[PDB]
Predict the 3D structure of the following.
Amino acid sequence: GPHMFANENSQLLDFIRELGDVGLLEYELSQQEKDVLFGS
Amino acid sequence: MNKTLKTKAFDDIYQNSAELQELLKYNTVKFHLAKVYRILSSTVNDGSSGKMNSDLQKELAVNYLNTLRYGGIHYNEAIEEFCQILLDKLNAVKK
């Protein structure tokens, strides 16, 4: 629901956002890891 | 040894939370966080986000974390702790 409880989530989002902006959110998944996350 | 954050207020936590950084090493964590990063950048692969819309992206982003936090559907222990530890310092910086 538009802007949930507290503003923690709000900050969390931009936090994670900055990770991917600088290259801290980059990752690599193996076949096994892809099966558990994507399901296929 | 890796990159640093863009906001110093946020960078503070990222440097001052080893328990947060250990979680972020897990590809399962890293993966689920990438899911939401797509959202804050765009709601669609056409474009979106010109001079607004980002406040709306906030909602769609939270929509994801709501399923990742305590009592979600595909919630993860490292994601649960990730948000807890993160927001912990975010609330502990508020004077």
Summary: The helical segments of chain B are 8-15, 18-23, 27-41, 54-65, 77-91. Residues 1-95 of chain B form a domain with the de novo design (two linked rop proteins) fold (CATH 1.20.1440.260). The radius of gyration of chain B is 14 Å.
